[PDB]
Design a protein around this ligand. Sequence first.
Ligand SMILES: Nc1ncnc2c1ncn2[C@@H]1O[C@H](COP(=O)(O)O)[C@@H](O)[C@H]1O
Length: 371
Amino acid sequence: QGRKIFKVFNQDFIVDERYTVTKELGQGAYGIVCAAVNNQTSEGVAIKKVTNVFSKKILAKRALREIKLLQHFRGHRNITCLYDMDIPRPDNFNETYLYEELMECDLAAIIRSGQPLTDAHFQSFIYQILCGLKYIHSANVLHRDLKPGNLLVNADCELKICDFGLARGFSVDPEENAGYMTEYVATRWYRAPEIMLSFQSYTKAIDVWSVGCILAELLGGRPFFKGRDYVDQLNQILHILGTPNEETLSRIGSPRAQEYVRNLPFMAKKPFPTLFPNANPDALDLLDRMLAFDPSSRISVEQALEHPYLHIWHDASDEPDCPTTFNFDFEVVEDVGEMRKMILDEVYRFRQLVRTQEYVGQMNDLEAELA
Ligand SMILES: Nc1ncnc2c1ncn2[C@@H]1O[C@H](COP(=O)(O)O)[C@@H](O)[C@H]1O
């Protein structure tokens, strides 16, 4: 066997025999999470059990999507790092276990606790998000669901992006781009406006908007655009940013939505210095550029990394790209028998993998020479 059984969240939890489960960490619609300790090296790990993966066709394509993407982004300082995977009962399995680097809480919890944070904290948090996002975008991947709940933090307040279940491809070819699949809908409070206004402009700007929502939530201690439905969400956004111009209005690809926005009374822009009168002026200037209503005027990731707000942290020699792009050919598969085969292949191939001029060089060549 080589495995142990634990009882957590009123179910079974089958782990490698080298570990001991220690604490429950939470639930979701997609699995349960516990913390553990390697009884040998003493390092801590988190163990995530994806549940009921072959109950619906959409849960199965979600798990395969997350498995492949976590492998593609291993080894970045600002992305959660996958260590191992395991399928305990391969004959009739309906779950897979992921072994990941262990963190302490998420950013939503820190904001909820009311613990005081300085402006240097805001700078560090926003810079780390942008470094991880630049890596992801360089592989032509859109995250699509950035928010404080998907950002893990530890005691040193280092930050790591997680949860790739909603990610989607991007291509400069608009026929290629129009063909990437979107199984689920993102969290309403952080979703960019051009998605519900039918701009047909699914670009990397959709992730930049979410980062702006996060900086605004940090500055006010509470979510910034907090709609109860989509109409309420649109009203709260126009109330802050104001009536759009004629170019922007014509871009609304939906007739009922364009008719509604065109008929509202005039609304002036509320300047961010009036909403956060005690904040760093550089913070509000970057906030204004990330929360641009029209995606064509919105700041890019690389422009944001160069903004004066972040000049202490910025070092382009420390902000890498991903070596290769990610391929989304698997999402075409629509047979659940094929998807069980692909998942088994991913796990066994990964398990085998993880178990496998400067001055000194110039002087070594000169020494072997003189000798
Ligand atoms: N690598 C990790 N380290 C520590 N806690 C985590 C980790 N991944 C997820 N969690 C937490 O486990 C819970 C489950 O979240 P979910 O990703 O929705 O299943 C949430 O409270 C997360 O913040």
